[PDB]
Symmetry: D2
Subunit: 457 residues, 4 copies
């Protein structure tokens, strides 16, 4: 079809619901078109915002009853993802996300007009005067992105991490009776149990996940209502308040208007902190991932104290740790995303930080990739972790760390000799102690109890 | 003096109280000796830890009264900074901080022996058997570093940032009636007040400082009691618990043993997040600092809406020109801090098995950030922020050209008769153009054009 | 169709040329499927590698004549991009890029078999025994990625940056007679010309671009020939040498086998340095971009010494600097990409760094986004930069920096008084000097010559 | 002593040679006073610069013979480190380094006046009129910092890295006949030699050091002569040219004035790239260091293919166990260096108009990286690398289980009769299993199974 405005006539695909402005933008912004389409999470959140906005304005007498109801309906459709294919703009547009705001306004306006029995392009429901009433791209984009990130955390990241925590916790309980060598500086230290080792991974995830959930609270403070620079000019005094209330009712999260609307436009420090906590979580996943591949290294020239499930339905102990590699590659990508967000966050100027799209994009990318990788790592590796009892035992029984009990039982002299023999002849302390006649294969087991070292209290 | 360890005997300065393992580290790790001596915050915190440890072991029957009391006295002297010159080791030593732990054990043990009328190097009060009783460097170093960082936040960073928040809050109130041009994309936007702008800076600091204080809570969870790998082997069953209790009594902070002792040794994710929050605060300071120098730019060919105190001559002299030197020092600290964060988070991802062996550098870079920011924020506050003043004339010059002030005319005398006043008081003041044309009087003008109404529409 | 191997039977789209292994991989690797498809630059380069490999093996007597010629033909087709749609794997696979290597082997094998009159799936031309002869994913993936990045630099980044340099150089020459205020610490300093100011931007780009081109040379050292761990086991002693020679002949770049093949597999330090130089180039683009929006800030409350072309075919001086915003958002993304690559580069273990896919991806992303952004910034802003003579003049003529000549002509006392009057009455130094009778509007122009300050020698 | 500047008079220590602007900076920028005093490398380089400047101005008739000669003598004393204690300013001062430039001008001018029998504070040899003649802090600070960094690379970093390359090269040759198991994905792979593995470390250092030396060339382009903004206003037309010439004579490096003087003041992209290359070198050192500690891990329940020197007792004692402490110090320096790079590159993107005002921190973080790496590489080399020895028994234990050694049997006595020897000498040595089964003799075995053939197939 052909839409007409004071700027001229533009041709838009007859099946598309965006308007002339979006069509022009689609033809002008060509940076990263293939991989950087504006995240749909932002679009869905924008739908929620526009829906709450129509309701607020209607209630405050800023919009005609019928037109408002049509907008509310059209907006809800966007939220339900019925118009995802009508948003073709990239992340690399204006630093205020103006193009996407107008894309949202045009699609919802045209659909609203259609609902009201008007052909697309009529603007019966005006994109700017109605759908964008009392709003600016300046305050609505950051509002939409804060909501998008908060929802993405609950929808994808938390379920994935909480799932892996449950898996590790289950494995930790199941293997808590298996005593093994503990290592510090990568060197043989003292005994621990495989359950204690795996439990530490679960603990790191609980600790880092808790921090993400705490930082998440900063996202509850929205810029909505401050309009262009934070003064709220052109918006009803209660517009922001109501929009926040409705967003909170729809999401179940305690959203509210930021105590200071100026800072909510000039910076996005709350988002920076959320990304930072996600980065720390990623760091813990790298630590855990590496522990896993090192413990599974082998079959014979590594550590090999645990085995991981085959990558494709190669015997146990010879499986390449593919899930660790995919996970850690995601982790290094996440650290880079954090760098991008924090760097951008320090670059605001006066009344508006103009790096909003990329800050939102890199944070969402991190959330989605981590959610994908954690879920994959969990289902395809973590859940199938098993101990290699033979390897664990061989290391423990032949290690000097078990000589402790001997020193008090038969004196250091004899114990030291037993250890020296075992190491020299590559035998277990029990075997050496037997070939020396210092202790029977019976007395040894009564004096040397590995679990007493791993659980000394 | 001759000192010894399991490896043998070595010579140490007769006037120093450290021992053999300190001497070996001194000689074997000549890395960053000039600028990277282990932070005294860590040494003082270690003194607090060793005092609590002796107190706990005595209470639990693990140490004799005589020796324990001497150790407690010696440790307290360390906390008071009386032995600072007896810690000569660098940050770049063993990754577990073993050498500094032994430096602490040796100094306290020697001073304790002396307090008991025993000679130095005698080890009557033994560094390992007594001062380090039930401990490992693995759990004590991170315990001491978490305490050190938590205390430094309260002692230096918070007071500085809270001070700047107070200054900006006061300035915002004082200039809240000064209407000016807002800017978006760096372009002229709708009116705002200077008070709202400065107030936004204060808000950013409140928001970021709040996050640092929330992340600080993770430091309350200590590794103490986990000994070598987290099992607590060699420690009395109640040792860790009592030490954390005593540290809480000593500091006023709610220190407790971490729920999972193993993760407390294998990683320091809590410290990583504290540093991360500090990085965000630094980012806010850069944004604020840049706003300040841009607003004060010029003073003739820049924006120049505010003026700042002139504290030094400067390189190139020009009457009225004041380089924003305090902003430059602050932003240089900010870029340093982002690097510190990079270092801490990188190290945090590199733990292996039961121990992360990057502890010293993680603690050092976090403390450096705290100290530099505390220094720079306080300096910026005292030497610039407190002296910020508006340039009323320049502010008004810009405002009068703002199209928003002309919107009240379009619907008061017509769009043409209003746009015409724009082609007159432009290509000075609109209040004059309307007068020269008779379209409106100066009395009615100020009645139709009320900039504050635009800055505060609600 | 249905392919059959020792692992079982698999169903592959009748129109797709990949095999059972790729089909299984497509179904197993689900991390970042939407935005992280393996870069086609890597696929095209792999085609070049496989083509050179077939030729080398044929010449060395490692492959049957006919089968080799069919492979060479199939490979060339991949290079020409005729099979781009037959590579559906993501970047987040094994850290060795094994899945993509096999994807390349299967597609080329099936096409080769078809050319030889054999239905797809027959393996007449064997993916592993023929197409992958004397090769490993370990040495071929990094070889393909080094070639991909080097070509991407010449094909996209260099043309874009060289173009902007030409633009700035042209503008610098054209505006070299326009004297203006120079600024240090953001404060009024001494006079310069708009041409000198714009010329500095061109210089930064020349300097940073030169560094990228120097680091590029490190990519000429390929891992090809080292096979699994660098020993060259299972490959002809001259296989690597010949493959490198053929790659060099086809690209026009002096590719060769790395002096040390072990290091070429265990690390990719050369790629890290290339990304680092790209990061520095990005930093210069941010500096330049910011200078541009600050100089164009206005219309009346900023600097406004230059104007930028409208974003859509808003009067001069009121145009939002959209191209700067898009460019700087790309810059912060690039800094993050560099972080990812350098971090990954330090994580190699023993004989193989297993972060290859992500290191390659983040570097290529940076190259493509910068190429896109620089070209856009150039065509839509840089080329249309114009001076705002009125603003420039008003700042210069009313600035104390022009009083220098006065001091020597009429003494500091009078000159200082002239400046004090001009600033007090907001008038030009010439006007003030006239209202004081110290100098005529004629004598002033003979004593105060701005260009003599901007070009003192 | 009373000293003065355009702002007024101030009191300075009677035993110090600095002036008023140094004193003001001393008092107004108390940021990082303990660890961030301006690098002496920059001070020494500034001495070289001021010496060349006086020499150039004298040659060009811009300075009197008497005063010029005194300044040259005074400047040379600074280069020799005779006045190090007279530079008390920190890195976190003005972003242009103006305060340090004046600190240099004041010390040299006072010493010059004294050399001419004049009293301190008299300014017979004036800090601004003579020592700073034809210069600005804007062009001299980056000139001094580029020279400082270039010299530090040659004086400290290159010798250290070249030394380690030599050590690894020697070790690789000595162990090139020791066949071992290669590892990919951390899993057992095909055979290689210990010499090839260690050789790869040497290669990584050669590759990264080469890039640092290439980036170093960008530092040869100096800002000198551009004065305040790049125009050269106030400088003699040949001043910059001669100064660069004299600096080249003095240092042996090909210093020249940058083609574009403006970009030399508005940015320091060359320094950013040098730091970037240093970061890559650090990454290689981490990879190498990690390989070293993993190979030495154990020594009983780890990989343990190599052993390293034991330099200290350590925390937990176990016969034969040696913590890889030198690797820990080195990798902690590496994570610090990545942070330094982040800082330098961040600052590099923040220049505005005619001047980047993050100069001090950019120079400082680069020099810190150079010095810490030089320290750590040298330490790691002397205290660990030079003592690396193979654990022949462990290496052989792993190799014998490698499937590749069994491939020569499958086609020598059958796949079944070969796979059977794998179910015997596994669930010790394959050379024994073949004997106990009579399938092959020990003489024929070593004739069929030649591991080196696998490690060196070409």
């Amino acid at each position: 079809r052909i839409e007409r405005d004071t700027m001229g006539e533009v041709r838009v695909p007859a099946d598309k619901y965006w308007g002339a402005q979006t069509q022009r933008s689609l033809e002008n912004f060509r940076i990263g078109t293939d991989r950087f389409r504006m995240p749909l999470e932002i679009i869905r959140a924008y739908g929620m915002l526009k829906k709450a906005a129509a309701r607020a304005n209607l209630e405050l007498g800023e919009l005609p009853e019928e037109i408002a109801k049509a907008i509310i309906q059209a907006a809800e459709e966007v939220v339900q993802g019925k118009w995802d294919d009508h948003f073709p703009l990239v992340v690399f547009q204006t630093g205020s996300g103006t193009q996407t705001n107008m894309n949202v306004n045009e699609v919802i306006a045209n659909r609203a007009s259609e609902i009201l029995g008007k052909p697309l392009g009529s603007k019966y429901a005006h994109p700017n005067d109605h759908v964008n009433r009392g709003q600016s791209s300046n305050d609505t984009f950051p509002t939409a992105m804060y909501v998008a990130v908060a929802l993405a955390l609950h929808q994808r990241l938390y379920p994935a991490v909480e799932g892996l925590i449950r898996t590790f916790t289950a494995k930790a309980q199941a293997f808590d009776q298996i005593v093994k060598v503990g290592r510090t500086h990568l060197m043989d230290a003292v005994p621990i149990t495989l359950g204690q080792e795996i439990g530490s991974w679960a603990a790191q995830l609980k600790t880092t996940l808790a921090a993400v959930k705490e930082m998440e609270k900063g996202l509850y403070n929205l810029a909505i209502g401050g309009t262009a620079v934070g003064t709220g000019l052109n918006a009803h005094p209660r517009f922001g308040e109501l929009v926040a209330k409705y967003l909170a009712e729809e999401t179940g999260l305690p959203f509210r208007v930021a105590e200071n609307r100026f800072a909510a436009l000039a910076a996005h420090d709350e988002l920076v902190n959320v990304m930072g906590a996600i980065r720390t979580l990623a760091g813990a996943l790298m630590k855990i991932g590496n522990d896993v591949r090192w413990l599974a290294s082998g079959p014979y020239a590594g550590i090999g104290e645990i085995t991981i499930p085959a990558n494709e339905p190669i015997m146990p102990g010879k499986v390449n740790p593919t899930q660790v590699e995919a996970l850690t590659m995601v982790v290094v990508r996440v650290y880079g995303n954090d760098h991008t967000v924090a760097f951008a966050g320090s670059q605001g100027n006066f009344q508006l930080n103009v790096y909003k799209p990329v800050m939102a994009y890199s944070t969402l990318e991190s959330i989605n990739l981590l959610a994908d990788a954690v879920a994959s790592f969990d289902a395809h590796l973590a859940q199938g972790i098993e101990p290699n009892l033979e390897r664990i035992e061989e290391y423990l029984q032949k290690n000097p760390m078990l000589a402790t009990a001997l020193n008090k039982a038969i004196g250091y002299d004899k114990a030291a000799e037993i250890v020296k023999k075992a190491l020299k002849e590559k035998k277990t302390l029990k075997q050496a102690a037997l070939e020396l006649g210092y202790l029977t294969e019976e007395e040894f087991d009564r004096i040397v109890v590995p679990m007493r070292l791993a659980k000394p209290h």
